[PDB]
Design a protein around this ligand. Structure first.
Ligand SMILES: O=c1ccn([C@@H]2O[C@H](COP(=O)(O)O)[C@@H](O)[C@H]2O)c(=O)[nH]1
Ligand SMILES: O=c1ccn([C@@H]2O[C@H](COP(=O)(O)O)[C@@H](O)[C@H]2O)c(=O)[nH]1
Ligand SMILES: [Cl-]
Ligand SMILES: [Cl-]
Lengths: 213, 213
């Protein structure tokens, strides 16, 4: 990932989303598109981003359904052009495998979300996170998502998945996570609001990159 | 809910989804639309269903993001016409409250998904399900989703939420759940494939209703 920086484009209208992404295109080559934008503008927005920016697209859908439905969601998502999809690990191994099956068939990637970055994650997710990470390792998952907001937890996750695995981390900026500290364990950071809500997105992205040069 | 039967419309193309729903419209007044259909045809499909069938629409999105993103997803979904949205409880209380806030503002409903119906749910969700249910009760949640595939678990969930709460349950038919047994605890059953994949959807729906009379 270019500059170890992934833009979380959660604006909800195409003009703004495309405008802001364009303002920071020189600093990134990977964009995470989620439901706020997709539900507001349609799945065709993914193809629009790929054609306009020639960027990698990670669908931050955090799939969390039964196996059969997970397969359908992944199929629809990859057909739309997504290079990868983020899947929740809490629902179990069968639900994860369903996503892996479609990813293998279509030559795409799966990112396993272990622990989440928000406060509520401490209630149920945190206690299962280490086991969810191990589950991913046992199934050969190579891409993971961990919390920037809890460096020691992110560090433990890194220990479990190993140095070879790819780890990205949200929660940098708006949620309180620090770019540099997070990159001690993650290969790339996910940044949304700190950039897309900034007075000048380009300066914001440049500032982040400057602090981690 | 008419006939205590909610149709899970997970077909992935407009023509088929509308045709099948039309075939069983005389037996239902509530349809659950999820990502397989919405990602394939766009969120406008929700409005299409409401105007063509005058039915209640439950968005089976199982929202499972951080609070801020959950708010955006719920807002986009309710603006699209959804009467209710299904929210995952495992991400915690703040993520649930975010959904409740938007539902309150827009005069819509939130259904809290406690334990899931597939095998993988036993790995992490099951052990947290009773507490997730209690969390919902403590926050005043009145609508819940529990597994048809585990009658005793569904029964325990009913005990926790009380007779007052509304409980719907997926996993009937394709996943092995029995309509009658499930309705001993749930107010309504969610049925997808057993109906929409049937040679004769209308006959399939009638058959289910027959054994429930
Ligand atoms: O544990 C997680 C999983 C997903 N995200 C997502 O990552 C982005 C973080 O954006 P922001 O807080 O930098 O604005 C959003 O798209 C959000 O939905 C998190 O924040 N935390
Ligand atoms: O625990 C859960 C939560 C959601 N669903 C959803 O309920 C429907 C069940 O459909 P079917 O198995 O009758 O086809 C699908 O939309 C599915 O995604 C489950 O099956 N189990
Ligand atoms: Cl995400
Ligand atoms: Cl659902």
């Amino acid at each position: 990932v270019m500059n170890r920086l992934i833009l979380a484009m959660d604006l909800m209208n195409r003009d703004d989303a495309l405008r802001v992404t364009g303002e920071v295109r020189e600093y990134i080559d990977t964009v995470k598109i989620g439901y706020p934008l997709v539900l507001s503008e349609g799945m065709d927005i993914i193809a629009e981003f790929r054609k306009r920016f020639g960027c990698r697209i990670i669908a931050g859908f955090k799939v969390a359904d039964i196996p059969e439905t997970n397969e359908k969601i992944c199929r629809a998502t990859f057909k739309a052009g997504a290079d990868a999809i983020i899947v929740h690990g809490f629902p179990g191994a069968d639900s994860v495998r369903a996503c892996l099956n479609v990813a293998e068939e279509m030559g795409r990637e799966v990112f396993l979300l272990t622990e989440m970055s928000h406060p509520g994650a401490e209630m149920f997710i945190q206690g299962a996170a280490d086991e969810i990470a191990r589950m991913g390792v046992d199934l050969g998952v190579k891409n993971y998502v961990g919390p920037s907001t809890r460096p020691e937890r992110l560090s433990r996750l890194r220990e479990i998945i190993g140095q070879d695995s790819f780890l990205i981390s949200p929660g940098v900026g708006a949620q309180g996570g620090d770019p540099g500290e997070t990159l001690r364990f993650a290969d790339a950071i996910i940044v949304g609001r700190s950039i897309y809500l900034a007075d000048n997105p380009a300066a914001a992205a440049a500032g982040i990159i400057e602090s981690i040069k």
